Curated annotation (Swiss-Prot), chain A:
Name of the protein this chain belongs to: Major capsid protein L1
Lineage: Viruses, Monodnaviria, Shotokuvirae, Cossaviricota, Papovaviricetes
Job of this protein: Forms an icosahedral capsid with a T=7 symmetry and a 50 nm diameter. The capsid is composed of 72 pentamers linked to each other by disulfide bonds and associated with L2 proteins. Binds to heparan sulfate proteoglycans on cell surface of basal layer keratinocytes to provide initial virion attachment. This binding mediates a conformational change in the virus capsid that facilitates efficient infection. The virion enters the host cell via endocytosis. During virus trafficking, L1 protein dissociates from the viral DNA and the genomic DNA is released to the host nucleus.
Top-rank taxon: Viruses
Species: Human papillomavirus 58
Record localization: Virion; Host nucleus
Amino acid sequence: AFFPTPSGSIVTSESQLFNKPYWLQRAQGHNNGICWGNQLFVTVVDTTRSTN
Amino acid sequence: SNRYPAQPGSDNRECLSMDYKQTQLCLIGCKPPTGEHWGKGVACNNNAAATD
Amino acid sequence: KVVSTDEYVSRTSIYYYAGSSRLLAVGNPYFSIKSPNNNKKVLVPKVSGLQYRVFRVRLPDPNKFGFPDTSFYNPDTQRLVWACVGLEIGRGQPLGVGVSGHPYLNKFDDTETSNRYPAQPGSDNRECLSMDYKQTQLCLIGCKPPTGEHWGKGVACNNNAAATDCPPLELFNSIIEDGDMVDTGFGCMDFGTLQANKSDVPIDICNSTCKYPDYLKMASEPYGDSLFFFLRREQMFVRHFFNRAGKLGEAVPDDLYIKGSGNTAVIQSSAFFPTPSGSIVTSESQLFNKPYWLQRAQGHNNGICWGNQLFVTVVDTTRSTNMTLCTEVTKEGTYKNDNFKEYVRHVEEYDLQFVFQLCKITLTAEIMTYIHTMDSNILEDWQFGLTPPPSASLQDTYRFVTSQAITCQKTAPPKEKEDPLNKYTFWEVNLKEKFSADLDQFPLGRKFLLQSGL
């Protein structure tokens, strides 16, 4: 009954996702940027900035 | 290195630590986005004593 | 003089999405547990992250459609056949790599830092160990099931010479059945029959035949209808160094080394083996969740699906987590070790999308010879070359059947048995009931219609 331990590797600044804009040209669904109910949901997950 | 015999004891828990997996993702929607996992779903009416 | 498949067909301009349901696969990663009373009833199957998950779709007959616009499908001379023009294989589990482990592996010594003379004797030194695997990804698509070889046993020779007892060697070409294990970094051979002590590879290989897809013969097939399109990417590198334990049957010559004595009176083994280990697995170098457009296949059969079925095979080793469950039998206020029983499980999912295009095939007399010599079964199903069976009237009737005017009449001919594929196990996925035409209600045609320039 084994279990391994995951560790991951170095974290750079070239391989980041944040602090830079995006432009929604054409979304993947059908409602291309329209939001109803006057709200929308953003969720982010970050591990690289989790110093304890 | 792991040789015979085993090193027996009624408890062998340790005080360890480990790192995690590096991960980043972003997500936009006009609805709370869904997610999944494996949960304990109940059996059929009888297994007739097959396996715990 | 095989001609290509774009001279005797004629592409139409009408497109058809299809789409599978979400498939799952739950079982044990190590061994297929059987019944305590039965040897043919499985309880939990052996599914792992190291197998050739081979899909076999089944397309519906295009001639079993009824169109109102009967101006293009002229059934005097022409017939219909699909073509593949796209594909997408998705996954839905996180990126995670799994380990396998033998409990009696032949790790005799350690041969990278210190193997200090003399020997430590003892007539058993096997033990429990575990390691990572050669990580890989590939996919093949074709109208015939893929071919793959493996090294194996054979008749050695005749019985004149008596030089040294050594096993013979011969590779074997066969068909890649599902459930078989990929090569994993210990050579593309049988391990059941060519090894004996079953204690050199981990437990998921020790009764298996690690085949490998013949990229060379399947490329050089004369019709070219086993490989539409193929991708691959893999890496591995060594982790440690060990060595086996036994009488090395082939002697090491005294020429190559200075003879020694004292503490060095008994020469050691020269039978090493390394251990593979896949490095970091990213999500940048993935090979799934991306479309693939076949603008021109590599073979002659330019995407056209004879036989109304495809064979898609795919294997991944990056998504090979092992869920470990832990349960108890009693409730005790202190920690114990005899109070718990634990279990290993592995889950697996897939998804297929397709986009097909049907094209009509004219049938001259010149053409119907050419299709006849490729395979005769394809002309049988369209029912174009047939004969009248003879024998106008029989007399095989009686009003009473269970009597004494009887010859003990027998029936049930085995006539519907024609496919030679039932000796092999495929994963069947049904596509006969899920075609559609309005692309835009589906998660791929919107990624397709921008590609067409419309």
